[PDB]
Structure 1
Amino acid sequence: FGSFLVSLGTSFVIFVILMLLFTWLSRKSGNAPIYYPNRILKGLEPWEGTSLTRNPFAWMREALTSSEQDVVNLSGVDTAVHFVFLSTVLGIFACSSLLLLPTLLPLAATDNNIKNTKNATDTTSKGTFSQLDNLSMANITKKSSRLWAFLGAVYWISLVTYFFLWKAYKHVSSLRAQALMSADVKPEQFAILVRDMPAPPDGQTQKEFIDSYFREIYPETFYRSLVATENSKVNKIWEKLEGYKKKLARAEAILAATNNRPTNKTGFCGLVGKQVDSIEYYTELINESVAKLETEQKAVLAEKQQTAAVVFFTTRVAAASAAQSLHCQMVDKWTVTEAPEPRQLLWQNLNIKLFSRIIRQYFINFFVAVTILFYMIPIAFVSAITTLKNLQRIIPFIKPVVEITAIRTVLESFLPQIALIVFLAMLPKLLLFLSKAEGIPSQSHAIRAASSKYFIFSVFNVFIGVTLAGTLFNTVKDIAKNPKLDMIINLLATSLPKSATFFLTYVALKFFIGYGLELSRIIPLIIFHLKKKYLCKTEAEVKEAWYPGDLSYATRVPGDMLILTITFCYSVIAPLILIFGITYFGLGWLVLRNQALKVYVPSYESYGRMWPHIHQRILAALFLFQVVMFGYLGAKTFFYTALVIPLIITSLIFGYVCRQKFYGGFEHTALEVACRELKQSPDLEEIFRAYIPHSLSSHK
């Protein structure tokens, strides 16, 4: 029955790829070759290969012929490590499939569902019958041979996962080293982040206190130190000024007559008739804006500087080594962490005392857990709202009857779908924002935390609220006296197959639609053209109208690694999912290679820091796999424990060993590559000219 959904998705993919080819030949930049060459010297630009008389297979050929070195030269290293993630998991699934075929033979040999266990489907229920349900779950009797669909297969998949995870982890460390050593002077090797300075200068100013306290430690090694400020006000004034300047440029571009823009379009004003001569109206607004900004800047740099600062050593060695050293015999003072990118640290979030971060961490996590548990509770009320049918208030009265007889059968269920999907759409941004308040400097750290929270959300959503009951809002009272893990294990063993069919359908769905839209970029194309017909009419505005943005590693890796957990946790239960996971990760490799090589542009560096988290969670997913297989084989009577338990211990040991052998190589950079080959003399002022906040820039 899932063949219908699979066919619908396949048709969607065909339509979207046809649209891509039908559009790629056009003179467009929000599509096939895109913004990235357009700003990078027309490097990846649609040259004679993608120019006139282009190959319909040109994008596929160019993507498949690239190299990891070429990608890391074009885009950031993090893109390379993401591609390594896809490659290594694809290899894992490929070798599992290479061992798959033996498992298929017992699927058609043993015939539990075929044999007398039907009893008319218990005469009161239904479930595993789809002409492939027989071939899935292996339908083995309670004590048959079952060796292949048991400990042997999980041993094989665990060993291959260990081997590829290790090799990929080593390869990512090698890319980190190679890209870190052969770099230029970027303003990170010259700075640190001290952000728990003791507040009182007992009769002095904060900056002098930082200067004294670090001049006592490192003589003859400093440019000078920058202290953080309550920048909120000047930031606000600064976006006011930037918007005023943009609107002035917007007004200036008419070049035909004096423009008069009313205030009704903005909405937060009523000077609609005062639009007259708006082209100069901004000038005094800017004049007032620039005067206020200058006054606030001059006032803020001496008054109420906060208890946190960056520092600037004069040699890469001192900077890269001081950021890992305790600066007080007490720990709650002068906390030091390696400085982040100028474009990746969070001034607003920074300056948070250690205890405040500790409290924020636990309350934010508790809030996330409470939201996950109580998720559907408001949704039920929202669905119950009378919004179902509001025909009584139809003012236009254009075509009332035509919509209430034919299509009304589906919109009634679609409104709860709307209420669900709106929260789904808001969820990534909300999780990102919640991760911000944990204190979390180095925005990439916030992205990683958001990825972790979204992955936990997604697994505890799908695997639970799909397979078993999700509401429990009356049941939670009873579960206080609920029995032990035996009932949960039996429930897993019973409910795995139908959920396996459902996840087959869901992987088909997500695969088809997601990769179709991503490869097409049809939605951003529509937005671009619509805005261009709309507001975008000057060259400055239109250029900003097709900024692609980063890979959004915040929300991509959670989905991909969720589908990884799907691939594992049922890997030998329903060997069908293996081919679907392989095709998902393969097409993901292809499409993401084409995209990240031709459209996307990173906004971080992260120098491969994302990988250890990915490996940690891949291994945790395999651990969940192997525990579930232990339980399932505990149900189907066999030699469970002495088979599975040792390799569960092995998975834990493998995690510890991999951590101990490489994780230390991702936190700090090094001292070797921190001293190696400084040829050009470092600059002094042009280092502040990076970490100075954008708003607080114009100053003596």
Structure 2
Amino acid sequence: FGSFLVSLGTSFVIFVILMLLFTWLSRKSGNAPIYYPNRILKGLEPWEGTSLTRNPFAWMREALTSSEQDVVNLSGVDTAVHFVFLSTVLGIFACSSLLLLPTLLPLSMANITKKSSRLWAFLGAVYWISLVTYFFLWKAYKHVSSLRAQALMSADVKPEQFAILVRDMPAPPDGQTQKEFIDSYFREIYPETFYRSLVATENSKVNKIWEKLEGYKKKLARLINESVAKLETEQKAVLAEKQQTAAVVFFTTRVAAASAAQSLHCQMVDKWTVTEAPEPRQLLWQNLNIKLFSRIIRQYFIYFFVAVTILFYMIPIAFVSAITRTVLESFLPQIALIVFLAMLPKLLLFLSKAEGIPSQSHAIRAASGKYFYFSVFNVFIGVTLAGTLFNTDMIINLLATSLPKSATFFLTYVALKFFIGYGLELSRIIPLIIFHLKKKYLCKTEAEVKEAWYPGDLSYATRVPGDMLILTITFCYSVIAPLILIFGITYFGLGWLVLRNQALKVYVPSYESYGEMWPHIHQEILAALFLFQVVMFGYLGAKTFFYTALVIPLIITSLIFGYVCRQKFYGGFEHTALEVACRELKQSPDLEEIFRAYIPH
């Protein structure tokens, strides 16, 4: 039945890996090992060495032996955190080796015939999974916190440390504009440890003017005067009589800034909401000018709209996905779901960043959260509706919820995410074709680097939640059908390998976010596990033997584990600690460069 999809996937990997080995060992090396030219050559060869050292395949080199500190040397701590996430999920699904050999051995109903056929073994399996996940999650969480501390205390001096973002503000002083109002206020509150302070202004007439002028200047190759005059005029205009509500404030020592940010500032929380100032390149200067009601009103309207769009996908798209010479009919709904769900990281990110989230490093996280809500209800409603439209007592319901939906769609969809997916991702075939087309067609006149050259960040906004849909669809069916357990374990293995290659050779991070997005990942893994435990409570209950009173303990255990983890480690993921603040770097920093690092245009 579904074997055609796996065959197509393995053929696609054969093709794309053939293309990789045929193309990377060539003069296209400016593309496939892209992270090395920038950050001057360290992989500018099909090795880190001379003498025709191609030897395909060449991942017996550092690709497999990538020191956990080597990666954080060659990429931000964010990359190392993502790797520990991949490794931990691989660990959970691998340490479940004493669930695939025993529980699959119990092979006219085809599944267990609703009669005591060691359903106790199923309870054993659910305990084993719910136990190994706890163990690995704890270990990994300690490890990530240790990485964050280690790279946070030895980091160089960066302008994100001497600053806070004072998001809200009582606008009127009634006789003076806002710059001197901030001056008076923070001077009263923080004497002699307070350097200077930008006041967030408007980006319209000019910010767009600067963008257009930059475009015009870029056009110069082998008019502008009016543009630069307008720039000067609107620039002088904006730095006066606009002086919006929010602002950003710089302190003279690393200790005092990290002390202020975690603090409070007026005995009515709805005014002067200081917060650890984000990194310069992700400050998101658009959403500052929002009071504390507007954030909440916007947020609840956004959640209502997310619920509405959840329904507007789950009716028609799940109907279409419940569809199942027929081989084309077997392939079609796969890519149909890929297009119906491959959109909407973008709409979620737009919608979320419109909730006033004042930093890209948090907009990405919020979009990932909303996407996880989409994913869970994808699994739930998709399988339920597929089973129902498959059928027309409860035993029939059990048979339909177990075998068809999983064994066809959930088994093969991951295969559409691995072989064809990671296969396309590693070769970077389509970036290769677009780059070469850019070279032949209209180029940037030797500004090819300032052209289709620059890789994005690893985009930990479609790679995180995208590679968690299958984590959920894996935990949920982990003991229903260990076949997807083998599929998920091989998925995360291939993902670790190919993504280590890409992180070491091609990708270049944009922001830093030293360690965040891990507690989010942890809470999300835990939520997947909790949903798994509830679903096995349900299915085993449908199997009419009452070890459900034995399964409830795991539900309580997951809730309590969440509480203890969030309270015993996840308070260190919101602030640089005062100790680390005192030991960030002490070599006489100058505030002037820092201050020049937040001028927006």
Q: Shorter chain as normaliser: what TM range?
A: over 0.9
Q: Write the deviation string for residues 263-288 of structure 1: whole angstroms up to 9, x where unpaired.
A: xxxxxxxxxxxxxxxxxxxxxx2111
TM-score by length of 2: 0.93
Question: Which residue, 329, 334, 359 being the options, matches 1:417?
Answer: 334
Unaligned 5+ residue runs, structure 1?
107-134, 251-284, 385-406, 476-485, 694-700
In the TM superposition, residue 473 of structure 1 has moved relative to its aligned partner by: 18
The 3 A distance-change label for structure 1 pair 137 and 43 is: farther
The 1:499–1:539 alpha-carbon spacing in structure 2 relative to 1, beyond 3 Å, is: same
Q: CA distance change for structure 1 residues 570 and 328 in 2, over 3 Å: closer, same or farther?
A: same
Equivalent pair of 2:47/2:53 in contact (CA under 8 Å): no
Which runs of structure 2 are paired with 1:59-70 in the superposition (5 Å)? 59-70=59-70
Judged with a 3 Å threshold, the aligned counterparts in structure 2 of structure 1 residues 138 and 590 are, in CA distance, closer, same or farther, namely farther
What are the superposed Cα offsets for residues 198-246 of structure 1, whole Å, 9 maximum, x if unpaired? Answer: 0101111101001111000010011111100012211110111011001
Partners of 1:222 and 1:312 within 8 A in 2: yes
> Per-residue CA shift, 1:627-678, capped at 9, x if unaligned?
0111111111223232101111011000000000011000111011101263
Kept after mapping to 2: 8 A contact 1:37/1:598: no
Does the 8 Å CA contact 1:48/1:54 hold for their aligned counterparts?
A: no
After superposition, what is the alpha-carbon deviation per residue over 1:142-162, rounded to whole angstroms, capped at 9, x for unaligned?
Answer: 232414531111111111100
CA distance in 1, matches of 2:84, 2:211: 39
Q: Distance in 2 between matches of 1:494 and 1:24?
A: 45
Return the offset for 1:579: 1.1
Q: Give a deviation string over 1:362-414, Cα, whole Å, max 9, x none.
A: 11111111112113778899999xxxxxxxxxxxxxxxxxxxxxx99999999
**More deviation, 559-568/656-665:** 559-568
Deviation, 1:36, is: 3.6
Alignment length (residue pairs): 599
Structure 1 residue 168 displacement after superposition: 0.1
The Cα of 1:521 is off from its aligned counterpart by 0.3
Which has the higher mean CA deviation after the structures are superposed, 415-424 or 524-533?
415-424
| Change beyond 3 A, Cα 1:507–1:409 | closer
* Whole-Å separation in 1 of the counterparts to 2:187 and 2:575: 24
Q: Determine the C-alpha separation between the residues in 1 that align with 2:108 and 2:144.
A: 36
Q: 1:493 Cα shift? A: 7.3
The C-alpha deviation readout for 1:312-366, integer Å capped at 9, x for no partner, is: 0101110001111111110100011100000011101221111101011111111
| 3-state SS of 1:7 partner | helix
1:192/1:312 contact within 8 Å kept: yes
Say if 1:591 and 1:172 are closer, same or farther in 2 by CA, change over 3 A. same
Find the residue that maps to 1:225 and give its secondary structure: strand
> For residues 157 and 476 of structure 2, what CA distance do their matches in structure 1 show?
46
Q: 1:641 to 1:411 in 2, by over 3 A?
A: closer
1:455 shift after superposition = 2.1
- The question of whether the paired residues in 2 share the 8 Å contact of 1:136 and 1:497 is answered with no
Percent sequence identity is 99
* Counterparts in 2 of 1:545 and 1:295: CA distance versus 1, 3 Å: same
The 1:500–1:543 alpha-carbon spacing in structure 2 relative to 1, beyond 3 Å, is: same
1:189 to 1:577, Cα distance in 2 relative to 1, 3 A: same
Indicate the residue corresponding to 1:470 in structure 2.
387
Kept in 2, the 8 Å contact 1:497–1:574? The answer is no
TM-superposed CA distance for 1:32, in Å, is 3.0
Q: CA 1:310–1:545 in structure 2 vs 1: closer, same or farther (change >3 Å)?
A: same
Distance 1:204 1:497, change over 3 A: same
SS in 2 for 1:539: coil
Structure 1 residue 465: deviation in Å?
2.8
- Structure 1 residues 413 and 623: CA distance shift in structure 2, 3 A: closer
In the alignment, structure 2 segments of 5+ residues that lack a partner are: none
- Larger radius of gyration, structure 1 or 2? 1
Contact 1:349-1:439 at 8 Å conserved across structures:
yes
TM-score w.r.t. length of structure 1:
0.80
Q: 1:608 to 1:442 in 2, by over 3 A?
A: same
Give the Cα separation in 2 of the matches to 1:136 and 1:343: 63
Aligned partners of 1:680, 1:689: CA distance in 2, in Å? Answer: 19
SS in 1 for 2:247: strand
- Whether the 8 Å CA contact 1:201–1:209 is kept in 2: the answer is yes
Answer yes or no: is the 8 Å Cα contact 1:232–1:348 preserved in 2. Answer: no
The structural deviation recorded for 1:7 is 1.1
CA 1:429–1:441: 2 relative to 1, 3 Å = same
Q: Deviations over 1:124-179 (max 9, x none)?
A: xxxxxxxxxxx499722323241453111111111110000000000000000000
Residues 318 and 385, structure 2, Cα contact 8 Å, conserved in 1: no
SS of the residue aligned with 1:306?
coil
Aligned in 2, Cα 1:566/1:138: closer, same or farther, shift over 3 Å?
farther
Q: CA deviation at 1:40?
A: 3.1
CA contact (8 A) 1:92 1:160 kept: yes
Q: Displacement, 1:502? A: 2.2
Q: Secondary structure at the match of 1:634?
A: helix
Q: CA deviation at 1:559?
A: 1.6
User: Residue 41 and residue 105 in structure 1: after superposition, are their counterparts in 2 closer, same or farther (change >3 A)?
Assistant: closer
Q: How far off its partner does 1:541 sit? A: 3.9
1:423 and 1:515 map into 2 onto residues whose CA distance is 19
Shift of residue 459 of structure 1?
Answer: 2.9
Q: Sort the Cα spacing of 1:90 and 1:347 in 2 relative to 1 into closer, same or farther, 3 A.
A: same
Q: CA separation in 1, counterparts of 2:190 and 2:28?
A: 55
Cα 1:353–1:575 shift into 2, 3 Å: same
When the two chains are superposed, the root-mean-square deviation of aligned CA atoms in Å is 3.4
**Distance in 1, Cα, partners of 2:48 & 2:130:** 47
Residues 298 and 355 of structure 2 are in contact (CA less than 8 Å); yes or no, is this contact kept in structure 1?
yes
Aligned-residue offset at 1:42: 4.0
**CA contact 2:29–2:45 (8 Å) conserved in 1:** no
Contact 1:149–1:572 under 8 Å retained in 2: no
Which residue of 2 is the match for residue 87 of structure 1? 87
Query: 5 Å matches for 1:32-431?
Result: 32-42=32-42, 45-47=45-47, 49=49, 52-106=52-106, 135=107, 139-147=111-119, 149-249=121-221, 285-375=223-313, 424-431=341-348
Verify the 8 A CA contact 1:548 1:601 in the aligned structure 2: yes
- Residue 80 and residue 381 in structure 1: after superposition, are their counterparts in 2 closer, same or farther (change >3 A)? closer
More displaced 10-residue stretch of structure 1: 8-17 or 26-35: 26-35
SS at structure 2 position matched to 1:302? coil
1:437-478 superposed Cα distances (whole Å, 9 cap, x missing partner): 010012110001111112222332344235415999999xxx
SS at match of 1:307: coil
Distance 1:180 1:68, change over 3 A: same
Deviation per residue, 1:95-128 (Å, 9 max, x gap): 112442111222xxxxxxxxxxxxxxxxxxxxxx
Once the two structures are TM-superposed, the CA of residue 46 in structure 1 deviates from its matched residue by 3.9
CA distance in 1, matches of 2:580, 2:512: 17
Q: In the superposition, relative to structure 1, how do residues 322 and 44 fare at CA in structure 2: closer, same or farther (>3 Å)?
A: farther
Question: What SS does structure 2 have at the residue aligned with 1:541?
Answer: coil
Residues 444 and 606 of structure 1 are in contact (CA less than 8 Å); yes or no, is this contact kept in structure 2? yes
**Deviation sequence 1:39-90 (CA, Å, 0-9, x none):** 4344565456476241102134321011110000110101001000011111
- Equivalent-residue separation in structure 1 for 2:219 and 2:40 (angstroms): 28
Q: Is the 8 A contact 2:317 2:337 kept in 1?
A: yes
Q: Distance in 2 between matches of 1:313 and 1:137?
A: 71
1:548 shift after superposition:
0.5
- Give me the whole-angstrom Cα distance separating, in 2, the residues matched to 1:433 and 1:10: 36
CA distance change for structure 1 residues 677 and 448 in 2, over 3 Å: closer, same or farther?
closer
Distance 1:362 1:488 in 2: 41
Which digits, 9 at most, give the CA deviation of each residue in 1:467-511, with x for residues without a partner?
A: 415999999xxxxxxxxxx98995697455543332112122221
Alignment correspondent of 2:559 = 652
Alpha-carbon distance in structure 1 between the residues aligned to 2:349 and 2:287:
13
* 8 A contact 2:321–2:337 mirrored in 1: no
Give the match for residue 697 of structure 1: none
Contact residue 564 and residue 581 of structure 1 kept, 8 A:
yes
State which drifts further: 541-550 or 328-337: 541-550
Residues of 2 paired with 1:247 and 1:417: CA distance? 43
- Deviation per CA, 1:300-322: give whole Å up to 9, x if none: 11111101100001011100011
CA contact (8 A) 1:97 1:579 kept: no
For residues 267 and 137 of structure 2, what CA distance do their matches in structure 1 show? Answer: 40
Local SS of the residue matching 1:581: helix
